[PDB]
Write a protein that binds this ligand. Sequence first.
Ligand SMILES: [Cl-]
Ligand SMILES: [Cl-]
Ligand SMILES: [Cl-]
Ligand SMILES: [Cl-]
Lengths: 195, 195
Amino acid sequence: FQGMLPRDERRGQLLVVASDVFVDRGYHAAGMDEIADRAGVSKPVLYQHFSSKLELYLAVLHRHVENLVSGVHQALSTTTDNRQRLHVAVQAFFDFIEHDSQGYRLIFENDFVTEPEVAAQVRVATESCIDAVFALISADSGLDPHRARMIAVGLVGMSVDCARYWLDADKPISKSDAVEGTVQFAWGGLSHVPL
Amino acid sequence: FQGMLPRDERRGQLLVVASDVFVDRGYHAAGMDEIADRAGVSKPVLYQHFSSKLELYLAVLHRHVENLVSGVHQALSTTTDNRQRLHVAVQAFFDFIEHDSQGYRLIFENDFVTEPEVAAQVRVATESCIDAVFALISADSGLDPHRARMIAVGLVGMSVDCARYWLDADKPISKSDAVEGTVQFAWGGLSHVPL
Ligand SMILES: [Cl-]
Ligand SMILES: [Cl-]
Ligand SMILES: [Cl-]
Ligand SMILES: [Cl-]
């Protein structure tokens, strides 16, 4: 099947450059001329790969979303020892936001409100993570769907909030401490906070 | 002291009417003429109490914020048995969002972005709840300030997220079940979800 054929190496390089420009300028100020300039490709070659600035922006957003979502899903498939996969998944999330700073900004601090499809892509990806957690909670607990879904939302939201606090506070503790603190709270709740 | 003198009964009635109009119309479409009309007061009497539509909007927002924030603080002073005050506080929050629907919309679904002071009033009130939780976690645990603050953000955020999910899903379970589910997850974490 053609979906297994080698990835377009030039496409990947163009997305990295486009991500730099979109994050630096914002969507409206960013231009295909600057992206072509910085990619070292002619503007017609850039247009052969991406017929519009919007298609390129959505491709950049998707590359960052897929990086995070695949990392979270892969974490959840490592083990069915829930305490352990909770750490692998929270770790994957902190690893993403620390490593892929442009991705963090594009997903969690998106200001391109003029295009509803951008906010929708963020919601559908967020819902993919909540759905993955909901599927595990439903399967591994006696909670009925309504209760499992509320806890899945609480768990994902609590995780996002701890991480955003840590990153927005300029990393006041190590990433390993921030991940472990978030995991211990998610697993044991207030009842297991050190006394 | 003059701060203990009786409340202005007409002021309170005007705020209830103003809240109806602001929620129904949005800030920009709302007018002092409609508020005066519905309050059964003359427009000069309305202006004797509130010199501008913005002052009236901020007074409406504050009345709703104070309702929630005082309810949360009072819940936290009822008992130092943390498992119990966690329920009293989460209950106070669900009671507010269910009873004070206009307050829920004005605080959690605010669309008046043209006035930065509106978003700031919501943030400073949110921070008052996080600060109250942080003060308890710091005092009742061995967590240092950075770790206590991250957990306080996670706890408040998780609570807001469970409640917003419940309300946005048209209350698929009873408020008592939604409160208890949120409290049990906050207290015991994933480790104590029914098996
Ligand atoms: Cl490709
Ligand atoms: Cl960046
Ligand atoms: Cl008064
Ligand atoms: Cl309402």
